[PDB]
Amino acid sequence: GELAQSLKELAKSLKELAWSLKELAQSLKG
Amino acid sequence: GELAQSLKELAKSLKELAWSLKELAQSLKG
Amino acid sequence: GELAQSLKELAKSLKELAWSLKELAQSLKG
Amino acid sequence: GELAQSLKELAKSLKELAWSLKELAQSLKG
Amino acid sequence: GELAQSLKELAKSLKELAWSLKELAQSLKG
Amino acid sequence: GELAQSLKELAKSLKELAWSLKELAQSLKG
């Protein structure tokens, strides 16, 4: 269940990453 | 239990990331 | 039950990520 | 031995990712 | 060890992602 | 055994990603 809390954490980070790259994409179209 | 749930969470984040990287790629061809 | 399902879902998200990376790699080539 | 070490290393990489996301979020604000 | 092959896979993908974002960064400075 | 090794691999990739996201953030302030 420690392995699990770390993978929960990674999944939260990757979600924020995906959000950021979406905002980056939006500003690069213009 | 915990782990399966973590892994579902991780999978979801990863499809979100993949989508945003297609959007990033599209904004750069754009 | 829950677990092996989690792993089939992770495995699909990983391929989606791998195809999006391939598209981002290509859009970064001129 | 090997395993718990693996997990302390993952846990540090997750914070580094979280601080880099915070810097990327801020550079994406004007 | 199936969980392990999936995490090996994710680590390979995230490595390529980090590569791409480096090339994206290089082209955005100019 | 396998899992600890996967997790070491994952951690390494994640520090590489964090670095590249600092470089991306820097190129956008740039």
Residue numbers in the entry:
A (entry chain A), B (entry chain B), C (entry chain C), D (entry chain C), E (entry chain A), F (entry chain B): 1 to 30
Paper quotes:
CCs are quaternary structures comprising two or more α-helices supercoiled around each other with cyclic (Cn) or dihedral (Dn) symmetry. Here, we describe variants with all combinations of the aliphatic residues, Ile, Leu and Val, at a and d to give four classes of peptide: the ββ class, with a and d = Ile or Val; Lβ, a = Leu and d = Ile or Val; βL, a = Ile or Val and d = Leu; and LL, a = d = Leu. Peptides are named systematically appending the one-letter code for the amino acids at the a and d sites to “CC-Type2-“; e.g., CC-Hept becomes CC-Type2-LI.
Nonetheless, both had extensive KIH interfaces linking all helices and, as such, are CC-based structures. And LL sequences form collapsed structures. However, the cognate structure for each sequence did not always have the lowest score, as apparent from the off-diagonal white and blue points. This occurs for all of the LL-based sequences and those βL sequences observed to form collapsed structures. For these, we propose that the collapsed states are adopted as they lead to more hydrophobic burial and contacts. Inspection of the models for these alternative states exposed steric clashes associated with the β-branched residues; e.g., threading of the CC-Type2-II sequence onto the CC-Type2-LL-Sg structure resulted in irreconcilable clashes between Cδ and Cγ1 atoms of Ile residues at a and d’ sites of neighbouring helices.
